[PDB]
Amino acid sequence: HVEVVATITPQLSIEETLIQKINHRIDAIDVLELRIDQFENVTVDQVAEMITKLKDSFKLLVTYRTKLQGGYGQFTNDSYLNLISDLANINGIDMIDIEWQADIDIEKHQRIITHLQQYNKEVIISHHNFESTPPLDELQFIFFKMQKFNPEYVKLAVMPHNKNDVLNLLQAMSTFSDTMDCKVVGISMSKLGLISRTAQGVFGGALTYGCIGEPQAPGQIDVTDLKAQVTLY
Amino acid sequence: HVEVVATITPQLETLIQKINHRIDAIDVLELRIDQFENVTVDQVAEMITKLKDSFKLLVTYRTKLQGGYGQFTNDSYLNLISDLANINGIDMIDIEWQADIDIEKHQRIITHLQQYNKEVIISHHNFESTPPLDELQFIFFKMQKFNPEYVKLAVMPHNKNDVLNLLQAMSTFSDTMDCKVVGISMSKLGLISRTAQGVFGGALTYGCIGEPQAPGQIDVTDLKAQVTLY
Asked: Which InterPro entries match (chain A)?
């Protein structure tokens, strides 16, 4: 059973137009992802505010996507990890996204992830490669190192250059789905990789991301159409 | 691009209306005839004229062996297929393959059909399982040797790997071979193979007119809508 995620990226003052479009799609939204990287000097208090302006029909996921990994967040890596650790104190948050990459300080990441789970927050460790799709063995090894932190979800987004790249991503997710204990989200970007987002559930995937109006990732789809997709497979 | 196939199995007009309704989603109209007792190329011609100009006409005689109903000798079957080449209204003809067949007799029949300007779809179906990737590629290679217009392989997946294997086989073939390829992973588990057929090099995807004869079949109208997304 794939869950449909609706990504919003409001400004401190969460619109009234948006909150209404959200309620309209209540049936297609399992998880509401609140991106916050589009806020300069965003603070945990500001985020806490926005949350209340929302709260119970979907889980609330808060994501600060760094520019390094495709977002707007320019925070220092140090300030980034501090922000992620601080979001644990916001009672209304159900899921928190933490970025993974080769150069991370592993013991520090584990400390933060464990901290988050002690506050009963589901952790989504994610990795984004906008340049290419490593070979299958490499994809599986990335998934392996990420799940070592025992998160609730492991998320891998890669960029395809050919059909085999899409198939390898699907295979890596499918194989992971069959043997590992935590949930997996596999994303092959661009139109070439569309099948991974629509048939995410067929290959063991747990989440599929959509928008309410315009794409927040490689040509996004309205969650309503995405819900229809998940329902088709 | 991917051509959407609409499969029908009549019996020597309510259908005539349902097909015209979905006429915009139909690139090929597969006319299965194996559901008729003692089918003659003459009756086939009678039906075709009653149907037939916005889609190709594929005539398919699926033998019992390969999931159909056709109870013809291999001889009368191969002769039925050879004789279909005389019907001008037919654009494509489906000829079955299976490792034991007479290679030279088959090649003799395929070249024959192509002399009458018919597009040949050499096909193989396994309603029971999906062979390993290597074996899928083996099947494709054998069928490819006859230099047909299309090579078609339908398999029943048991698990996710079986679906990915079919897609992989079809994709790799797509990248090297000089003829069109068609891959089908049956059941709802394999639905993605029909909707994203063109993503992996497929040239034909099969749908229905309204009533499915099993799980995994999609109305050509919905199928066309899905194909259009990729």
From this structure: Aldolase_TIM (IPR013785), DHquinase_I (IPR001381), Type-I_3-dehydroquinase (IPR050146)
Q: How was this structure determined?
A: X-ray
By C-alpha distance, the chain B residue nearest A162 is B200
- Total Cβ atoms within 10 A of residue A152: 17
Q: Where are the beta strands (DSSP E) in A83-170?
A: 95-99, 122-129, 153-158
Following CA atoms B187, B189, B190, B194 in sequence, which dihedral angle do they give, to the nearest 10 degrees? Answer: 90
The alpha carbon of A4 is separated from its chain's Cα centroid by a whole number of angstroms, namely: 11
To one decimal, the resolution in angstroms is 1.9
Judged by DSSP in three states, B192 sits in helix
Query: DSSP readout, B75-91?
Result: HHHHHHHHHGGG-TT--
Domains identified in chain B and CATH numbers: 1-230 (3.20.20.70)
Contact check, Cβ <8 Å, A167/B171: yes
Residue A20: in which H helix or E strand, if any? helix A16-24
d(CA B62, CA B68): 5
Residues B196, A199: C-beta atoms closer than 8 Å: yes
Buried b (16+ CB within 10 A) or exposed e, B66-99: bbbebebeeeebbebbbebbebeebbbbbbbbee
Number of H helices, E strands in chain B: 8, 8
Helices (H), chain B: 14-21, 41-51, 74-83, 103-115, 133-144, 160-176, 191-195, 220-227
- Which whole-number Å values give the CA distances from A149 to A110, A125, A221, B137, in the listed order? 6, 9, 31, 39
Give the B-side interface with A, CB within 8 Å.
160-161, 163-164, 167-168, 171-172, 174-175, 188-189, 191-192, 195-196, 199-201, 226, 229-230
Contacts B201 to A, Cβ<8 Å: 163
Q: Which of A174, A232, A233 sits opposite B164 (nearest CB)?
A: A174
Token readout for A95 is 């899921």
Q: Per the CB < 8 Å rule, is A195 touching B196?
A: yes
Using the beta-carbon criterion (under 8 Å), do A195 and B191 form an inter-chain contact?
no
Number of Cα atoms under 13 Å in the Cβ half of residue A2 = 28
